[PDB]
């Protein structure tokens with residue numbers, strides 16, 4: 001979902017990259033370091049705009065992160 | 075001189091959408107509003123095909139104690155359309171209504187019906203004390219409790 | 223508790239229609255087509271199975287309403303060129319504007335066969351060509367100075 | 383036996399009004415002047431699509447069956463008229479080995495002096511029926527002429543069909559993807575057609591998009 | 598009068614042509630494909646029409 005013009009719960013409602021993104025996306029598993037502090041959004045009235053953020057909160061859930069956890073790793 | 079610069083164009087005043095008369099309803103009344111509902115060891119099933127499916131009425135109706143969609147969000151149902159659809163219907167204890175979800179476990183989820191973890195559909199339940207319940211007990215209803 | 227499962231082409235949700243309106247530009251849809259246009263009554267006779275009707279070059283120009291068994295002319299929502307008539311800027315900043323083909327309403331106004339002209343005075347005398355417009359009309363900047371529009375003169379006439 | 387398609391087996395190929403106009407199209411159409419088989423109830427191939435015509439006196443011809451194996455292994459189209467009503471179904475039927483009339487299910491429906499012309503094709507999951515009814519006065523052949531079959535029925539079957547049979551003269555030809563030029567009157571009805579591969583004059587009329595051409 | 602009607606009819610007819618795109622109808626690229634894909638299809642209709 002972390003790529004220009006993607007779709008899915010994050011790319012619609014939580015972290016959106018423009019059609020005209022210009023940058024690099026760099027990522028790694030943190031299972032060996034990271035824990036229900038990490039939330040994400042499931043619901044919204046409409047998509048957020050590219051590089052928007054928000055602080056209203058029911059629309060959110062926690063990720064199932066534990067050091068036991070590949071797609072379910074942090 | 076005379077020059078040409080840009081173009082005049084009247085813009086549309088309002089949005090008009092048109093479809094046929096809203097006939098050929100799905101007969102959800104035979105599934106939600108009937109006089110009789112099934113014994114869980116041998117639950118009823120009905121085809122849904124060739125029809126306008128009024129999911130909107132079900133979603134906005136107050137008669138349900140629980141309603142959920144198990145692979146879709148319940149607001150979309152009024153625009154969605156499907157290849158084939160089936161209703162299932164049955165009657166349960168409140169502590170065993172707690173087995174109606176994708177991939178859940180228990181005597182009903184082992185031996186009296188099954189939904190995939192990848193199940194697609196809308197699933198609903200309501201109180202029936204005023205309708206099903208009898209002062210002696212509903213012994214017409216059964217669970218296939220012990221099944222290998 | 224009573225329970226129902228609805229497990230999931232022939233099973234579609236209830237499509238909502240709007241109330242119909244005529245002789246205005248609208249953002250229309252009928253069943254499976256969409257556009258911007260004017261919906262209007264017509265004398266056309268489509269066969270009962272026909273739902274759209276066509277121009278010579280692929281373009282829809284009529285439809286049959288899916289509730290109302292009468293045929294609509296669809297007319298494109300009106301448009302035209304905006305041409306600006308000006309003396310040279312080393313004279314004046316006044317201008318007159320030609321809305322092409324549209325007949326003076328949809329837009330000190332003068333309907334012509336070239337379109338609606340706005341901001342030029344219709345004068346009964348004819349004069350030579352200074353700025354051309356079309357369909358015999360010209361315009362010029364003349365004296366209290368203004369843009370004037372009139373039928374042009376082909377010459378002084380002479381019975382020989 | 384075999385007979386001539388002449389200029390029959392043209393139909394309205396889309397739900398669109400056209401008038402005073404000469405429109406070019408490509409669809410499964412009956413090739414002009416091709417041989418059609420003639421019958422006075424065999425199983426037949428369906429191929430890409432069927433043109434079927436039945437000639438009448440006394441309501442002899444009741445309908446058809448369409449599918450592949452036609453004996454309960456898979457779904458199969460039934461189309462019938464019995465006494466005063468049409469019946470249409472698609473079930474996994476245990477049909478007879480040779481069906482005739484005396485004197486799992488997913489879709490069901492219930493409602494020579496004559497010629498009744500039909501075209502059948504199954505495309506993109508949809509069964510299409512086109513047909514025409516007329517009075518006639520002929521015994522030995524289809525009457526040489528032209529008419530267009532309007533669509534009547536449009537069923538989202540999704541059931542593969544490769545063979546068919548008749549239920550009780552009749553004639554059968556097969557549709558092909560040939561280009562047709564189609565002439566519509568002011569009333570919006572198709573009054574003539576050109577099969578654009580029949581002869582070099584038809585190649586000309588369809589290149590020039592005209593039913594009539596200068597020297 | 599024929600050529601100056603025929604080049605117009607030819608130029609109108611080139612509105613129906615696909616030019617290698619998913620479809621020639623402009624609302625039905627947009628109301629089907631997301632903007633990152635819809636622009637790669639509409640760049641075809643623009644190169645064709647132009």
Ligand SMILES: *[C@@H]1O[C@H](CO)[C@@H](O)[C@H](O)[C@H]1NC(C)=O
Nearest residue numbers: 101102103106107131132135
């Ligand atoms: C069932 O009938 C009741 C009548 O009170 C109605 O409110 C409800 O919407 C109906 N639902 C369906 C699916 O028919």
Ligand SMILES: *[C@@H]1O[C@H](CO)[C@@H](O)[C@H](O)[C@H]1NC(C)=O
Nearest residue numbers: 323324325326327328329333
């Ligand atoms: C357009 O011009 C005609 C005369 O040709 C006139 O009858 C009609 O009312 C005019 N349109 C408007 C909007 O005034």
Ligand SMILES: *[C@@H]1O[C@H](CO)[C@@H](O)[C@H](O)[C@H]1NC(C)=O
Nearest residue numbers: 332343344345346347371372
């Ligand atoms: C032109 O002259 C006629 C009389 O011959 C008069 O009716 C009309 O109003 C005049 N028009 C203008 C633009 O002066």
Ligand SMILES: *[C@@H]1O[C@H](CO)[C@@H](O)[C@H](O)[C@H]1NC(C)=O
Nearest residue numbers: 383384385386415416417418
């Ligand atoms: C089949 O068609 C050809 C012309 O293409 C004709 O010569 C031939 O006799 C026909 N055959 C039969 C048996 O009708």
Ligand SMILES: *[C@@H]1O[C@H](CO)[C@@H](O)[C@H](O)[C@H]1NC(C)=O
Nearest residue numbers: 453454455456474475486487
């Ligand atoms: C219907 O299809 C199922 C498989 O989906 C098969 O087990 C069953 O025997 C079929 N029924 C009939 C009447 O053939």
Ligand SMILES: *[C@@H]1O[C@H](CO)[C@@H](O)[C@H](O)[C@H]1NC(C)=O
Nearest residue numbers: 456457507539540541542543
């Ligand atoms: C029709 O045949 C195709 C194979 O060409 C197959 O994939 C499809 O499932 C078949 N349809 C039905 C309804 O059996």
Ligand SMILES: *[C@@H]1O[C@H](CO)[C@@H](O)[C@H](O)[C@H]1NC(C)=O
Nearest residue numbers: 267566567568569570571573
């Ligand atoms: C069109 O139909 C009308 C009857 O509504 C008839 O009078 C007219 O002659 C027909 N036109 C043609 C070209 O057949």
